């Protein structure tokens, strides 16, 4: 096989061996589950739901979170679209550009939200008959490989 997959084999084996060597026994714990405490709390409810509905729900929830983080200091010249792209509503004056900047953590959260939104929208495309099941699988593989 060509070089660009031979080197792929060595680079897969390198990470596999690194994980095998750097493995450590798990540390003793006390088994405090997280969602179980949520169920104990009065602020949460359980319900059987379709997964695609859950994705469309979580996309709106994360979009609202990020819009709140944007409108945390009341700076209206930064706008988040529904694809999790942060764009200026008007060309940024330098004072406002520096005044509206977010650390790497916010950008990482926005981008992982974009990833999950992409996956959820691909599944919606599958459910709406816009794409085939084969097309859905190929698109999911492209998302997770690019």
């Amino acid at each position: 096989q060509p070089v660009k997959v031979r080197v792929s084999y060595q680079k897969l084996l390198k990470y596999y061996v690194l994980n095998a060597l750097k493995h450590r026994p798990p540390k003793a714990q006390k088994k405090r589950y997280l969602f179980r405490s949520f169920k104990a709390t009065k602020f949460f409810q359980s319900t059987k739901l379709d997964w695609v509905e859950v994705g469309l729900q979580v996309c709106r929830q994360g979009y609202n979170m990020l819009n709140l983080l944007i409108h945390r200091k009341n700076l209206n010249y930064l706008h988040l679209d529904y694809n999790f792209n942060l764009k200026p509503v008007k060309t940024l004056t330098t004072k406002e550009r520096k005044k509206s900047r977010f650390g790497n953590a916010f950008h990482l959260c926005r981008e992982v939200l974009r990833l999950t939104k992409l996956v959820v929208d691909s599944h919606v495309q599958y459910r709406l008959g816009n794409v085939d099941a084969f097309q859905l699988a190929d698109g999911l593989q492209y998302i997770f490989a690019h």
């Binding site: 169920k39 949460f44 409810q45 979580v58 979170m65 709140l68 959260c109």
Partner: protein, 91 residues
């Protein structure tokens, strides 16, 4: 006392009300709404872990949602018979 599953349409009447901060139902009770948002990335895991499967048209899952629609966790772990899983991916 025990925890029971609310009707699936109840969470839908919250999301529509909770589309934006404009809605007047939640203007002063913010200490309970945004507090849960710190757990949002965790939720992003629980659905990508339980993401519907290629041979699965509808993937019904248990959902743990906040009383104000702020968050919706997939309260499940996709346990699968691993020989069955490998055979299915072989097909």
């Amino acid at each position: 006392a025990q925890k029971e599953d609310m009707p699936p349409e109840h969470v839908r009447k919250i999301i529509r009300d909770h589309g934006d901060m404009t809605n007047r139902k939640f203007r002063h009770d913010k200490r309970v709404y945004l507090g849960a948002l710190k757990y949002m990335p965790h939720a992003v895991l629980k659905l990508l872990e339980n993401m519907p499967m290629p041979w699965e048209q509808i993937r019904d899952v248990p959902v743990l949602y906040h009383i104000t629609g702020a968050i919706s966790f997939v309260n499940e772990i996709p346990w699968v018979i691993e020989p069955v899983y490998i055979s299915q991916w072989g097909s």
